[PDB]
Amino acid sequence: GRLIYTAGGYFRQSLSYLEAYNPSDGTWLRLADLQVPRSGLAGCVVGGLLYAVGGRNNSPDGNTDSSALDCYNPMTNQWSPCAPMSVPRNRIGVGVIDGHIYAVGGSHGCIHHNSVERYEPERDEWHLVAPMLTRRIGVGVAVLNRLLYAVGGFDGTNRLNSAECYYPERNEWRMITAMNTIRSGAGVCVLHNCIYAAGGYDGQDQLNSVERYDVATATWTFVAPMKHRRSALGITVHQGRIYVLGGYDGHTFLDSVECYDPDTDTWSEVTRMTSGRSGVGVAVT
Ligand SMILES: CC(=O)N1CCC[C@H]1C(=O)N[C@@H]1COC(=O)c2cccc(-c3cccc(C(=O)O)c3)c2CSC[C@H](C(=O)N(C)C)NC1=O
Ligand SMILES: [Cl-]
């Protein structure tokens, strides 16, 4: 029994919701709220524990970028603060290699990070690794073949279609084949040995197109687009299918949850979140 967890998000302000969807029965569980509301965060799982990394708390009073790492234990329904990152990272990308969390790019006020840092749960420590070749906020991150890919985003001047790859044993980055579409705020994940980039913002419009990167051929190929255009969507893989949760379509904050079946190349609306929101952190455990 694995659930799709959605943490935080944004609807008029940053949210503290932690909710879990069971794809087997269509139920949503209302779990313990985050101690501090956040949007632009990312979720991940290490050893059955859920992590909420970075983001920003936007309130009608003022906004605060987060360098926080918080840990949720599904067995206790309790959040526990962990060591914070070296810098606040809003609109962050996260990836897990060998039970180590990589926090990629993101923004802190006027700053757009190229810096990347790694968290070791067993030591409760963060350490900087080699920075990316490009500054990237709203960056999609995927782990494939024990390599950490940074896909698209925004370098502070332009939205990007470029993508790069990190070699943890060598501690270095290399640019890979760029996507067909410029995407900032896309949902990036790996399914069946392919990296998928769904939705995002091309600098003018929110996207519904979805493309996948094949490593053997080094080519990005378009697959069936989602029914709803969305940027700042949450994304995860569950039982061989991609799930996209919420997002922003340019006017409204989506509650729509779509599911991609790779065997039939089709998307379908599987459920709706309890309320519309963008900038959620998603993970499965
Ligand atoms: C103008 C603006 O962005 N805002 C002013 C008040 C605070 C802030 C505000 O509304 N943010 C909330 C939160 O959104 C995310 O968490 C979030 C999380 C991850 C990625 C992205 C993302 C997507 C596309 C491109 C880029 C890129 O970096 O180029 C980044 C976002 C921003 S989605 C845009 C939408 C918006 O602009 N309006 C006006 C509601 N913003 C949001 O949903
Ligand atoms: Cl924001």
Supply angle C-alpha 20, 22, 23, rounded to 5. 130
Amino acid symbol at 22: N
**CA-CA distance, 170 to 8, in Å (whole number)?**
34
Structural domain total, the chain: 1
Ligand 1 pocket mutation pick from 64, 91, 104, 229 by most atoms within 8 angstroms of CB: 91
Contacts of 49 (CB under 8 A, 6+ apart): 71, 72, 73, 74, 121, 285
Tell me, using a 6 A CB cutoff, whether residue 184 lines ligand 1.
yes
Supply angle C-alpha 269, 154, 245, rounded to 5. 15
Return the number of other C-beta atoms located less than 10 Å from residue 251's C-beta.
6
Six token digits for residue 243 = 């799930």
Residue owning tokens 């290699």: 97
Rg (the chain; Cα; Å) = 17
Element (H, E) at 282: strand 281-284
The residue whose CA is least distant from atom 4 of ligand 1 is 58
The residue whose CA is least distant from atom 23 of ligand 1 is 185
For CA atoms 189, 191, 193, 198, give the dihedral sign.
negative
Q: Determine the atom of ligand 1 nearest the C-alpha atom of 10.
A: 13
DSSP bridge pairs for 191: 194
Nearest residue to 35 (alpha-carbon basis) of 20, 57, 13, 2: 57
Q: Are 3 and 284 in contact (CB under 8 A)?
A: yes
Compute the distance from residue 107 Cα to the ligand 1 centre, in Å.
12
Nearest residue to 89 (alpha-carbon basis) of 62, 50, 59, 117: 117
**CA-CA distance, 247 to 280, in Å (whole number)?**
8
Tell me, using a 6 A CB cutoff, whether residue 11 lines ligand 1.
no
**CA-CA distance, 230 to 206, in Å (whole number)?**
6
Domain that holds residue 245: 1-285
CA dihedral 43, 46, 49, 52 (to 10 degrees): -20
SS3 content of the chain, % helix, strand, coil (to 5): 0, 55, 45
Please, how many CA atoms are within 13 Å of residue 163, restricted to the half-sphere of its CB?
31
Tell me, using a 6 A CB cutoff, whether residue 232 lines ligand 1.
yes
**CA-CA distance, 178 to 203, in Å (whole number)?**
16
**CA-CA distance, 161 to 202, in Å (whole number)?**
8
Looking at all shown ligands, the one closest to residue 11's CA atom is: 1
Compute the distance from residue 10 Cα to the ligand 2 centre, in Å.
8
Six token digits for residue 225 = 């687009």
Looking at all shown ligands, the one closest to residue 137's CA atom is: 1
Contacts of 261 (CB under 8 A, 6+ apart): 241, 268
Burial 100-133 (b: 16+ CB within 10 A, else e): bbbbbbbbbeebbbbbbbbbebeeeebeebebbb
Tell me, using a 6 A CB cutoff, whether residue 137 lines ligand 1.
yes
User: DSSP string spanning 27-91?
Assistant: EEEE-PPPSS--BS-EEEEETTEEEEE--EEE-SS-EEE---EEEEETTTTEEEE-PPPSS--BS
Q: Determine the atom of ligand 1 nearest the C-alpha atom of 56.
A: 16
Q: Are 219 and 213 in contact (CB under 8 A)?
A: yes
**CA-CA distance, 24 to 8, in Å (whole number)?**
23
Compute the distance from residue 52 Cα to the ligand 1 centre, in Å.
18
DSSP bridge pairs for 220: 213
Q: Are 45 and 284 in contact (CB under 8 A)?
A: yes
Ligand 1 pocket mutation pick from 207, 248, 254 by most atoms within 8 angstroms of CB: 248
Tell me, using a 6 A CB cutoff, whether residue 185 lines ligand 1.
yes
Tell me, using a 6 A CB cutoff, whether residue 37 lines ligand 1.
no
For CA atoms 175, 158, 194, 4, give the dihedral sign.
positive
What is the stated resolution of the deposited model, in angstroms?
A: 2.3
Return the number of other C-beta atoms located less than 10 Å from residue 173's C-beta.
20
